[PDB]
Amino acid sequence: SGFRKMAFPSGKVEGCMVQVTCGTTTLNGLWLDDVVYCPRHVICTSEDMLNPNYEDLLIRKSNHNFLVQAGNVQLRVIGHSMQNCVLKLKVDTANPKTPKYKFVRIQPGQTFSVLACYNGSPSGVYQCAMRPNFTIKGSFLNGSCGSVGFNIDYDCVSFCYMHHMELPTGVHAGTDLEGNFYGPFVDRQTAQAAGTDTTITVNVLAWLYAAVINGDRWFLNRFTTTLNDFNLVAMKYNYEPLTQDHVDILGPLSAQTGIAVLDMCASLKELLQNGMNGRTILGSALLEDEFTPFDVVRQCSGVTFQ
Amino acid sequence: SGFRKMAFPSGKVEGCMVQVTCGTTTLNGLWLDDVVYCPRHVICTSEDMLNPNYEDLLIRKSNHNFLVQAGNVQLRVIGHSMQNCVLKLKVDTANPKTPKYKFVRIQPGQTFSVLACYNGSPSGVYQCAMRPNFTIKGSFLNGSCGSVGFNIDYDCVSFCYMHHMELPTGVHAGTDLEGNFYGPFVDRQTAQAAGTDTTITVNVLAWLYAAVINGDRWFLNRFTTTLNDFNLVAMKYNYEPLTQDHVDILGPLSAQTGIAVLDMCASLKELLQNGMNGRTILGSALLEDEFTPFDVVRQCSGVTFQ
Ligand SMILES: *[C@](O)(C(N)=O)[C@H](CC1CCC1)NC(=O)[C@@H]1[C@@H]2[C@H](CN1C(=O)[C@@H](NC(=O)NC(C)(C)C)C(C)(C)C)C2(C)C
Ligand SMILES: *[C@](O)(C(N)=O)[C@H](CC1CCC1)NC(=O)[C@@H]1[C@@H]2[C@H](CN1C(=O)[C@@H](NC(=O)NC(C)(C)C)C(C)(C)C)C2(C)C
């Protein structure tokens, strides 16, 4: 019983966090095997910022301009390269704590855990989603750049996010671990329009199923809807279109609860049109969209990690 | 920028989680040095449950009736004792991953991180508060007993909760790591009245300060209130009394924001009386009470852990 915004256990990632310094700029890096990955803007000066030429900036640097600190221990940089918006620092020592890992570029609507760090030291862990507009609503202060997002599957850490910047609305932008930004963003100080966000419909449906699994049925109704008629209402409320593939993905939850997907869509329609009239669902007065179908199955089923 | 329900990094605790089996009952234990701590009801049969005599039950057990598994490795139990509602299993091997630790019995209104585990393996981490009625609103399934709650301060893990049981409302009850229940609960299957819960006023105020720090002032007003007149309104809305000690604890946040505590109390009063009229605070449509003053300072300041 219960339902919480649950992060993955962070231990496998904590062992990979380091501090990278170049000049007066210090941020975090990710140490896997003998490579440290970090945002390339570590190489920039404040005045380099409106349109840095990173190729030009990096050619002017030497291995010895990079200081990497793992705990108390300085790691010697023996090589460096740039891949998209990430810098790869080859170091003299392979990380003995390297977990089994992969790099993944996630789709909008997928969730991940963030290990927020400062000066190479973990501060906290929380769950995020990749928004439809390719921002994340994180909690990041000065010094958190290079903090990473991840998912865990059995023993394998799948890294999917590295933090780079804050947008004027207070939301966050960054890259995959190959250095490609999510969204239209670039690592320069130029005005940058974040698209208008939308609500992740398939996730709202997943969380309504979680509410049912946990014993709460008050928002259910006797109605059904067609997919087409549901999507007409979704559009009006700034919800993402629901596809047949989303319907299929919700199959396991529909089967467990005995509530067909399009019957749950009729409940969501009624909630969008009527509100909650002072009632809550899983302790929220808003419809929650940062749980995927898999997140619900995981937490209502008790999957663990090796 | 941003504000999330943030847990502590769990790595130091993950290294301490083990599986304990006695008969047909399997749950989690906490392995520190050469001792494994777990709920004493691991020794019970289903039929032992309405009023077990645990002294009588334990005298009938031998070291070899306890199976402890750390990962793939079986640890030999070489001694056993009962302390209140926890069983202490002395094992042949000291845990090489034992962190610096303490055991703490927390006050109602304090928060902690839970590492939910199953069969000795961590599943996820989330933040909880000890409610005024000494329950927690966790996420726990069959097999999660023996999962622990904790706080971290520099390098020191302060354990404060071990999970034992679920109450009929879906909330959770358990003990400190010395085996004393929080609240009036006992580890038997007898009807057990959980008191009527209340909202943690000092924490709501802390979270309103967090909202201001993060740039949002819409709920502020020009009014002030006396403590006495605030508490008269608190009572009507089932909020805990605010004391002068709470006011003092909110000092740092009041100083950082330039908003006196009793001025923030006037904003909360107006929110209780008027509602939010369709507005949100830090992404919530409800007033959030599971952040302490210290949690806010930590997350709006970037404290890390050694
Ligand atoms: C990280 O590098 C770090 N040291 O932790 C840093 C975190 C931010 C949070 C305060 C400092 N990231 C940057 O400084 C990043 C680098 C420049 C400027 N950056 C920003 O995040 C700025 N945002 C911004 O310029 N947004 C646009 C471009 C107007 C949309 C800040 C004003 C928040 C510093 C680059 C290379 C993008
Ligand atoms: C843990 O032992 C475990 N194996 O993980 C287990 C978790 C619960 C969640 C389903 C099993 N805890 C117990 O089984 C615990 C033990 C008995 C019964 N327990 C309960 O939690 C029961 N609740 C209960 O009896 N509540 C009262 C007493 C009516 C208020 C369940 C009905 C949830 C099993 C004891 C010793 C309390």
How many angstroms separate the first and last alpha carbons of chain A?
24
Domain final residue pick, B60, B80, B99:
B99
| Domain-located, residue A306 | no
DSSP letters spanning A196-218: PP-B-HHHHHHHHHHHHHTT--T
Structure token pair of residue A156 = 């394998």
A107: which residues sit within 8 A by CB, 6+ positions away? A130
> C-alpha angle with apex B3: A164 to B160, nearest 5 degrees?
115
Q: For A59, phi and psi rounded to 5 degrees? A: -60, -25
Assign A37 to helix, strand or coil.
strand
Residue in A111, A104, A105 with CA at minimum distance from that of residue A293: A111
Structure token pair of residue B104 = 């703490």
Mutate-to-test residue for ligand 2 from B135, B166, B169, B192, highest number of ligand atoms within 8 A of CB: B166
CB A111 within 8 A of CB A128: yes
CB spacing of A122 vs B305 below 8 angstroms: yes
Q: Do B105 and B177 share a domain, yes or no? A: yes
Q: Do B122 and B1 share a domain, yes or no? A: yes
Domain that holds residue A205: 198-301
> C-alpha angle with apex B187: A297 to A214, nearest 5 degrees?
25
Assign A23 to helix, strand or coil.
coil
| Domain-located, residue A286 | yes
Structure token pair of residue B170 = 């879906």
Residue type, B201: T
Assign B281 to helix, strand or coil.
strand
Question: Looking at chain B, which residue has its C-alpha nearest residue A119?
Answer: B304
| Gap from CA of B63 to ligand 2 centroid (Å) | 24
Structure token pair of residue B6 = 């943030």
Q: What residues of B are in contact with residue A150 (Cβ under 8 Å)? A: none
Residue appearing with tokens 């599971």: B290
| Domain-located, residue B282 | yes
Measure the CA dihedral A12/B296/B3/B172, to 10°: 70
Residue appearing with tokens 């303490």: B102
Residue in A177, A182, A165, A160 with CA at minimum distance from that of residue A87: A177
Q: Which of B15, B128, B301 sits opposite A11 (nearest CB)?
A: B15
Cα gap A144→A149, rounded to integer Å: 12
Assign B73 to helix, strand or coil.
strand
CB A150 within 8 A of CB A159: yes
Ligand nearest to the CA of A24: 1
Q: Do A104 and A182 share a domain, yes or no? A: yes
Q: What residues of B are in contact with residue A151 (Cβ under 8 Å)? A: none
* Beta bridge partner(s), residue B36: B31, B89
Q: Do B183 and B271 share a domain, yes or no? A: no
Cα gap B76→B69, rounded to integer Å: 9
Going by alpha carbons, the residue nearest to atom 9 of ligand 1 is A142
Nearest C-alpha of chain B: how many angstroms from A76? 22
Q: For A134, phi and psi rounded to 5 degrees? A: 65, 25
| Domain-located, residue B306 | no
Residue in A183, A172, A131 with CA at minimum distance from that of residue A148: A172
CB spacing of B302 vs A10 below 8 angstroms: no
Segment holding A270, helix H or strand E: helix A261-274
Q: Do B164 and B132 share a domain, yes or no? A: yes
Domain final residue pick, B64, B79, B99:
B99
Q: Do B80 and B221 share a domain, yes or no? A: no
CATH code for position A233: 1.10.1840.10
Write the CA distances from B292 to B138, B148, B191, B195, B246, integer angstroms. Answer: 17, 20, 32, 22, 11
Write the CA distances from A279 to A1, A85, A284, integer angstroms. Answer: 19, 46, 9
Q: Do B260 and B220 share a domain, yes or no? A: yes
Assign B207 to helix, strand or coil.
helix
Q: Do B59 and B136 share a domain, yes or no? A: no
Query: Exposed, middle or buried by CB within 10 Å (0-12, 13-18, 19+), for A71?
Result: exposed
Residue in B148, B137, B142, B111 with CA at minimum distance from that of residue B12: B148
Cα gap A214→A209, rounded to integer Å: 9
DSSP letters spanning B142-199: TT-TT-EEEEEETTEEEEEEEEEEE-TTS-EEEE-TTSPBSTT--SSSS---PPPP-B
The resolution in Å comes to: 1.4
Q: Do B10 and B68 share a domain, yes or no? A: no
| Domain-located, residue B83 | yes
Q: For B249, phi and psi rounded to 5 degrees? A: -60, -35
Q: For B210, phi and psi rounded to 5 degrees? A: -60, -40
Cα gap B298→B190, rounded to integer Å: 41
Q: What residues of A are in contact with residue B296 (Cβ under 8 Å)? A: none
Structure token pair of residue B230 = 């605030």
Cα gap A150→A160, rounded to integer Å: 5
Write the CA distances from A205 to A134, A228, A235, B217, B262, integer angstroms. Answer: 21, 16, 15, 33, 42
Give the DSSP letter of residue A98. P
CATH code for position A74: 2.40.10.10
Q: Which of A7, A121, A123 sits opposite B124 (nearest CB)?
A: A7
Cα gap A268→B145, rounded to integer Å: 35
Q: Do B217 and B84 share a domain, yes or no? A: no
A46: which residues sit within 8 A by CB, 6+ positions away? none
CB A109 within 8 A of CB A130: yes
| Domain-located, residue B208 | yes
Measure the CA dihedral B68/B73/B74/B79, to 10°: -70
Structure token pair of residue B284 = 């919530």
Instruction: For chain A, give percent helix, strand, coil, nearest 5.
Output: 25, 30, 45
Residue appearing with tokens 């918006």: A85
Beta strand segments in A167-275, E? 172-175
CB A204 within 8 A of CB A110: no
| Domain-located, residue A23 | yes
Structure token pair of residue B298 = 């930590």
Give the DSSP letter of residue A46. G
With both helix axes pointing from N to C terminus, report the angle between A261-274 and A201-213 in degrees, rounded to the nearest 10.
Answer: 100
Cα gap A92→A70, rounded to integer Å: 12
Q: Which of A119, A300, A304 sits opposite B304 (nearest CB)?
A: A119
Cα gap A66→A53, rounded to integer Å: 19
Strands B86-91 and B35-39: antiparallel
Cα gap B5→B59, rounded to integer Å: 44
Q: How many domains does chain B have?
A: 3
B57: which residues sit within 8 A by CB, 6+ positions away? B43, B44, B48
Domain final residue pick, B35, B65, B99:
B99
Q: Do B7 and B137 share a domain, yes or no? A: yes
Q: Do B54 and B178 share a domain, yes or no? A: no
CB A194 within 8 A of CB A167: yes
Cα gap B53→B188, rounded to integer Å: 10
